[PDB]
Design a protein around this nucleic acid. Structure first.
Ligand SMILES: [Mg+2]
Ligand SMILES: [Mg+2]
Ligand SMILES: [Mg+2]
Ligand SMILES: [Mg+2]
Ligand SMILES: [Mg+2]
Ligand SMILES: [Mg+2]
Lengths: 150, 47, 143, 46
RNA sequence: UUCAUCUAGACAGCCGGACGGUGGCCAUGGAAGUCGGAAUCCGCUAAGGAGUGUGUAACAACUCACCGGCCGAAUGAACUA
């Protein structure tokens, strides 16, 4: 039984983990192939952390906050070309911005969903927040979860 | 010792050992410890 | 503008000198932005710690030497790189949350306040050894 | 005893180990003593 | 001379910290603060830019803005003759 910790973000289909995987005798396309069992939900940027025990294919893809955020948008397509350069800015997720910060395993470092979910809403530099809205100082005027969350 | 002279004169007088106890003694024997050398006795020898 | 924010500090400072009945003087020489941010999470429950400039505290202390007086002789301790930890917990338990945890190669407790008293946090590190053998070694001076 | 820590304790803090700095001690702590107990502590001392 | 900063500690000098969401989003061989398009949000804070520069293939590493330790009383700009 051996131990380590290497992490490489982004996630398309399942592709070389460079030299860090190399001088360890994992494999090139095989470490990338056991990284398909992970990269499956979602299909646009993740945060995988592969564990190393002698030769163990442990692709435990830990939760990226901007990813539980981006994934909370719609869907549409998966790769190739998007008539321009892709876009995703609409999703409501009114009470899903905090149900995402609730999934922020401890983390947050603040006053529960009051400050964790006022920052996760901020992490949304791509979507459109609670139904029809934006961000900025519309977060300081939030009344939900919090007392229920904490 | 400094914080074990009147505290021992408290560990052999009165009854129990409260914070409001020794403070009516060291501040009565015309020679107290350091007030903090007294409140310590309400901590390191509890019960 | 800058009288603005400073005065706001006198505010939340004066408020801790009243509410919390106890205080630690900690020293954060070196100590990362990351170290501190995680002594918060560890003491989030009871204690709360407050930081700032020296010359802002030597004044604010004296700024209310009227009421709350025995914070007066806190001043010959608020030099160098110091910090404040206000609490309403017992002694021992708090200090070791600070003195020990999140140390790499941590911050240090140099003086403690409890109702006009000045603990060196060295007469706080008691183990009922020189305190139980003083409720007994004098009992042989009584028997 | 009770006067054994008030007549033997005031003898290290400069105080007349008798009844003015030992019996009044009980008085300055609300404790019922006796005019012949500290004297019984004064006699047992010899 | 005037205006502004400054004993609630300036200016300068040396010295410490320079964090979490988070490799933020498009974009691509690869771009994680730093070839590059658009935003500049929060947390925590005494303080820390979704980033001044050095640098990597891309991370690292360093630096800085911002805060502090030390000191102890002056500093900044526009003018007058
Ligand atoms: Mg960096
Ligand atoms: Mg670069
Ligand atoms: Mg801030
Ligand atoms: Mg002056
Ligand atoms: Mg000219
Ligand atoms: Mg003129």
């Amino acid at each position: 039984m051996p131990p380590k910790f290497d992490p490489n973000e982004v996630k398309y289909l399942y592709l070389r983990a460079v030299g860090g995987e190399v001088g360890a005798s994992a494999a090139l396309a095989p470490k990338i192939g056991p990284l398909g069992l992970s990269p499956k939900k979602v299909g646009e940027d993740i945060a995988k952390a592969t564990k190393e025990f002698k030769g163990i294919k442990v692709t435990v893809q830990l939760k990226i906050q901007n990813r539980q955020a981006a994934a909370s948008v719609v869907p549409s397509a998966s790769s190739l070309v998007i008539t321009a350069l892709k876009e995703p800015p609409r999703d409501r997720k009114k009470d899903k911005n905090v149900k995402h910060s609730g999934n922020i395993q401890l983390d947050e470092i603040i006053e529960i969903a009051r400050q964790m979910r006022d920052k996760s809403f901020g992490r949304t530099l791509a979507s459109v927040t609670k139904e029809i809205l934006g961000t900025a100082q519309s977060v300081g005027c939030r009344v939900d979860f919090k007392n229920p969350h904490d | 010792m400094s914080t074990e002279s009147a505290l021992s004169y408290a560990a052999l007088i009165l009854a129990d050992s409260e914070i409001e106890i020794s403070s009516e003694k060291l501040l009565t024997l015309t020679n107290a410890a350091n007030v903090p050398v007294e409140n310590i006795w309400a901590d390191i020898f509890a019960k | 503008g800058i009288r603005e924010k400073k005065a706001e500090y006198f505010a939340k400072l004066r408020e801790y000198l009243e509410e919390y009945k106890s205080l630690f003087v900690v020293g954060v020489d070196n100590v990362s932005s990351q170290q501190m941010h995680e002594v918060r999470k560890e003491l989030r429950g009871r204690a709360v710690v407050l930081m700032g400039k020296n010359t802002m505290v030597r004044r604010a202390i004296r700024g209310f030497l009227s009421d709350l007086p025995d914070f007066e002789k806190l001043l010959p301790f608020v030099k160098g790189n110091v910090g404040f930890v206000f609490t309403n917990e017992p002694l021992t338990e708090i200090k070791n949350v600070i003195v020990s945890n999140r140390v790499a190669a941590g911050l240090t407790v140099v003086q403690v306040y409890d109702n006009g008293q000045v603990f060196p946090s060295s007469i706080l590190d008691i183990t009922d050894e020189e305190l139980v053998s003083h409720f007994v070694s004098a009992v042989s001076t009584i028997a």
